[PDB]
Design a binder for these strands. Structure first.
Ligand code: DCT
Ligand code: DCT
Ligand code: MG
Length: 576
DNA sequence: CCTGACTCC
DNA sequence: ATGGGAGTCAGG
């Protein structure tokens, strides 16, 4: 702990070297329109701290941030890039991101700050962020000398750690994953987050007013049926009503008491009509609390946009997640909740929403990977399963039936048991067991594959995706049944979900390149795991109908072709 | 603050 | 004991 640095009053030439570690510090977790509290630069010439008020109003420093030929190493460069966009400054030339490097080396470490990354290489010359800024109501920027040292120490760590991390990624054959996929993706995600999605608040507010009335109506009906008022949103109070007052059968318990899960309640429907009303009430309550009230809370009022943050270094399989607000779990399955999507509108007059999704991309990936003839030949496979489990005609398969059969296809291939399946379809365990057995004989390649991948994980201690993403599974040889079994099912699932994640990431990169090449105004707004959502002038729809599916299809080559479905409309709802 | 709800892929 | 991966909310 002895680190020399200049606390600079003004930007100098030697801070603008062609390679540098750069820290642009934002303390708030949600970095949209958040204060930049300090800057640190480390390069061959030395270590510098700059006050943002100075640096960011300095035309040479701004010029250097925006010069792609001046290469910067950082940690969480998307955070910096977006915070700078909100200050009206363009950040270019990021060549190394320690956050993403750590994530690829081992997603389980949960690396969230430079110190946590530094620990991976026994680098101790830097403090965790939480130790410097503090928690909750105590959270604050420290005295300048202490802030400056922290930011310089983070930059020095990035400076020293770049090579050891790159060296290890190369050993793992993952450097291209970092440099050619994840880092370019981060810049595209930064663009999407900053663009935001426009919301029709008048529509959303009116929906909430009508939902309020309907909640009250259903609530009173529940009270009438129960013979008493109680808090329907307390599973504890509800448990007393259902299982003590009304004396309904107890099908399941958790550590806190009687289960009132949707699965349990649906099975109690033939006992008392109050359970169906309660399920509906909790659905309506979620719509209001989360997708009306929670959404309106994060709308920026002047522009009516919502700006999600896509976490690129969180999931254990290589998927993104979306927070504050989560735009990857907007309702769609019930028409009631689906109507929320009518409030998601284009950001400009005479623009439209364009949505494109990979049709069953994951199952095609498994077909390719497991090398299964029957599955490939099938390449509707979900509808086909609903004809089987419900024993019906193809033109009698309701979108609820198909939805149920999709859950069965994914259940089975990823190791559901006879018990789970029996519960899911409310059928006999014998019948469920024979359903699973039949599936594995119908597709013997999938069967062989799932056996092999588990043994491979036991031998190596990890599993990998098509583009060499890695998940370590140290629990996989555990003496404990439940613990071992979970790890076995991650070996079955992670390579396929993770590979499907790799592919759509590549597609986003490819797509943006083409949009730029063709000088289109169309741009990405959202990714929802197997779907890309764009907005564009209405004139570009014709072109987008060919371009976007073209690019997605040709992202990778597999034994099975990738298929893209696409729709467009006035609102997200209408993009179906 | 965690748990168990509901939401999506 | 009992397919996988996520985030947000009210209650307690
Ligand atoms: N140094 C490397 C090499 C590869 N990869 C990732 C990028 C794409 C994917 C493909 O691996 P390649 O060796 O480029 O192609 P391959 O012939 O299919 O090799 P393999 O079958 O082992 O994946 O792995 C990487 O991240 N870093
Ligand atoms: N119950 C589910 C639902 C989805 N997924 C994963 C598997 C596929 C991926 C995309 O989900 P969907 O788009 O709903 O599945 P799909 O096969 O593409 O079916 P559809 O044609 O209806 O989109 O997410 C899963 O593991 N379990
Ligand atoms: Mg799909």
């Amino acid at each position: 702990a002895k680190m020399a640095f200049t606390l600079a009053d003004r930007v100098t030439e030697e801070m603008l070297a062609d390679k540098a570690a750069l820290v642009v510090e934002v303390v708030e977790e949600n970095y949209h329109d958040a204060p930049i509290v300090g800057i640190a630069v480390v390069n061959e010439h030395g270590r510098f701290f700059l006050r943002p008020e100075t640096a960011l109003a300095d035309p040479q420093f701004v010029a250097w941030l925006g010069d792609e030929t001046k290469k910067k190493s950082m940690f969480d460069s998307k955070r910096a890039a977006v915070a700078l966009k909100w200050k009206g400054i363009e950040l270019c030339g990021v060549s190394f991101d320690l956050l993403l490097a750590a994530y690829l080396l081992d997603p389980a470490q949960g690396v969230d700050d430079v110190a946590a990354a530094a620990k991976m290489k026994q680098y101790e010359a830097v403090r965790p962020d939480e130790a410097v800024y503090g928690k909750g109501a105590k959270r604050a920027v420290p005295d300048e000398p202490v802030l400056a040292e922290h930011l310089v120490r983070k930059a020095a760590a990035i400076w020293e750690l770049e090579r050891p991390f790159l060296d290890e990624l190369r050993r793992n054959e993952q450097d291209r994953l970092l440099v050619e996929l994840e880092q370019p993706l981060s810049s595209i995600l930064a663009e999407m987050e900053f663009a935001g999605v426009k919301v029709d608040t008048k529509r959303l507010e009116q929906m909430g007013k009508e939902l309020a009335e309907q909640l009250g109506t259903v609530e009173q009906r529940i009270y009438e049926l129960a013979g008493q008022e109680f808090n329907i949103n307390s599973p504890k109070q509800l448990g007393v009503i259902l299982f003590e007052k009304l004396q309904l059968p107890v099908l399941k318990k958790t550590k806190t008491g009687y289960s009132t899960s949707a699965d349990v309640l649906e099975k109690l429907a033939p006992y008392h009509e109050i359970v169906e009303n309660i399920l509906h009430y909790r659905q309506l309550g979620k719509l209001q609390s989360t997708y009306i009230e929670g959404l309106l809370k994060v709308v920026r009022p002047a522009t009516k946009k919502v700006h999600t943050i896509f976490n690129q270094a969180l999931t254990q399989t290589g998927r993104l997640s979306s927070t504050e607000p989560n735009l990857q779990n907007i309702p769609i399955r019930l028409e009631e909740g689906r109507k929320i999507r009518q409030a998601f509108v284009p950001s400009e007059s005479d623009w439209l929403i364009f949505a494109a999704d990979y049709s069953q991309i994951e199952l095609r990936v498994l077909a390719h990977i497991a090398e299964d003839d029957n599955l490939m030949e099938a390449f509707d496979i979900h509808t086909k399963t609903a004809m089987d489990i419900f024993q019906v005609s193809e033109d009698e398969v309701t979108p609820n039936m198909r939805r149920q059969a999709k859950a069965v296809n994914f259940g089975i291939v990823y190791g559901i048991s006879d018990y789970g399946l029996a519960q899911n379809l409310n059928i006999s365990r014998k019948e469920a067991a024979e359903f699973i057995e039949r599936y594995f004989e119908s597709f013997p390649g999938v069967k062989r594959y799932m056996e092999n991948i588990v043994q491979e994980a036991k031998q190596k201690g990890y599993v990998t995706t098509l583009l060499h993403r890695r998940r370590y599974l140290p629990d996989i040889t555990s003496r404990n049944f439940n613990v071992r079994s979970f790890a076995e099912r991650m070996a079955m699932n992670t390579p396929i979900q993770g590979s499907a994640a790799d592919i759509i990431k590549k597609a986003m990169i490819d797509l943006n390149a083409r949009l730029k090449e063709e000088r289109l105004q169309a741009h990405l707004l959202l990714q929802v795991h197997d779907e890309l959502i764009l907005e564009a002038p209405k004139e570009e729809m014709e072109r987008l109908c060919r371009l976007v599916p073209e690019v997605m299809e040709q992202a990778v080559t597999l034994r099975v072709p990738l298929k893209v479905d696409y729709h467009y409309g006035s609102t997200w709802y209408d993009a179906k």
